[PDB]
Amino acid sequence: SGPVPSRARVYTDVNTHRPREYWDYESHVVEWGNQDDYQLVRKLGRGKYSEVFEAINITNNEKVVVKILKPVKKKKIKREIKILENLRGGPNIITLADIVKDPVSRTPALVFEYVNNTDFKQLYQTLTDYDIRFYMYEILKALDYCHSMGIMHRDVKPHNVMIDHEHRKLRLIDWGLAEFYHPGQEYNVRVASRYFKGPELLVDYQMYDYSLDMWSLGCMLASMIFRKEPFFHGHDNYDQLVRIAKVLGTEDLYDYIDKYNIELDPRFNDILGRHSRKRWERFVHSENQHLVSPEALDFLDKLLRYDHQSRLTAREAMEHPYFYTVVKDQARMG
Numbered sequence: 001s002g003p004v005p006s007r008a009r010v011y012t013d014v015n016t017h018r019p020r021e022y023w024d025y026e027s028h029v030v031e032w033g034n035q036d037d038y039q040l041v042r043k044l045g046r047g048k049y050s051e052v053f054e055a056i057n058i059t060n061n062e063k064v065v066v067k068i069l070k071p072v073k074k075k076k077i078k079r080e081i082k083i084l085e086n087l088r089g090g091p092n093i094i095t096l097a098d099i100v101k102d103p104v105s106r107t108p109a110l111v112f113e114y115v116n117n118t119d120f121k122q123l124y125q126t127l128t129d130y131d132i133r134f135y136m137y138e139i140l141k142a143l144d145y146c147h148s149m150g151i152m153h154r155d156v157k158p159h160n161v162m163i164d165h166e167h168r169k170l171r172l173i174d175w176g177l178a179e180f181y182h183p184g185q186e187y188n189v190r191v192a193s194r195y196f197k198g199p200e201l202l203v204d205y206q207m208y209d210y211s212l213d214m215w216s217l218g219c220m221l222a223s224m225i226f227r228k229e230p231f232f233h234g235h236d237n238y239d240q241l242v243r244i245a246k247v248l249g250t251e252d253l254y255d256y257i258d259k260y261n262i263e264l265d266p267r268f269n270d271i272l273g274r275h276s277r278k279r280w281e282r283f284v285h286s287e288n289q290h291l292v293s294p295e296a297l298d299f300l301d302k303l304l305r306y307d308h309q310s311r312l313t314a315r316e317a318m319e320h321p322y323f324y325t326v327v328k329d330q331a332r333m334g
């Protein structure tokens with residue numbers, strides 16, 4: 001017998017009641033801009049399926065970021081483009097400013113707004129309790145928005161959250177693994193960075209939903225308030241579930257698997273062993289305690305749950321008392 005089917009408990013049918021053209025990205029016709037508007041300045045990063053450059057728009061001398069998409073299935077390129085356009089103008093969603101191509105070689109490239117990112121491996125060291133709450137709330141705005149628009153990000157991690165700290169400016173980037181949610185659809189579990197993979201991915205439960213992103217966010221939260229980056233550090237996908245089991249415990253893991261009738265690789269049960277559930281307080285020490293509060297642990301504890309159906313929605317998260325001080329301070333008359 002197979003696994004129990006599942007569906008999202010929020011935003012379940014958003015693509016169902018939207019026009020075909022909204023989610024049918026294969027039929028999207030790209031509106032191409034002008035490649036000669038942009039000059040490459042320096043290479044920023046080497047993706048495995050792209051390269052990213054700082055660049056200037058020479059029509060207004062504004063910095064931008066250009067991502068060149070070498071070979072790759074056109075269908076993947078169209079998915080990212082349709083998702084970026086669907087989401088543009090959404091809170092803290094990176095803005096796709098242009099789409100261009102070599103008119104001769106046909107090689108496509110995405111142009112994004114420039115964000116003067118703080119290093120991250122450095123930034124988290126200097127963040128205050130208030131700073132983390134503020135930026136968590138901003139990330140949640142992005143996730144609630146893209147989930148409300150029927151899209152799963154599927155690659156939430158600190159590298160995909162650009163933060164211009166001196167402008168209190170946050171953008172969620174890298175929508176290259178993002179996908180439209182359709183209830184009942186069996187998805188590829190080969191998404192997210194190892195450290196931020198939800199348990200559903202790690203046990204090959206394919207019928208997942210937006211709640212995958214909330215696990216990844218939980219992992220980020222833990223790493224920030226406990227000053228341990230990344231928080232769950234497995235040496236591979238199997239080990240990664242072991243690192244989670246050693247904190248959340250094996251009993252709730254086995255209840256999860258049992259609830260969904262999931263069927264585990266035989267050798268999993270040998271390396272999972274048996275582990276009690278650990279109190280979050282066990283990770284609090286002199287050096288990170290100023291970032292930790294009981295509201296923070298209650299909040300974290302409601303994100304990091306095996307059962308994807310059990311995790312907070314972004315909307316519920318935003319209502320948590322952890323964010324009380326940032327919500328008062330954000331009600332802006334402008």
Ligand SMILES: O=C1C=C2C[C@]3(O)COc4c(ccc(O)c4O)C3=C2C=C1O
Pocket residue numbers: 044045052053065066067080084094112113114115116117162173174175176
């Ligand atoms: O799939 C991707 C991938 C990236 C990687 C990357 O190109 C890196 O660097 C960026 C950026 C966006 C804005 C920005 O300011 C910046 O520095 C990125 C993306 C957006 C996407 O949808």
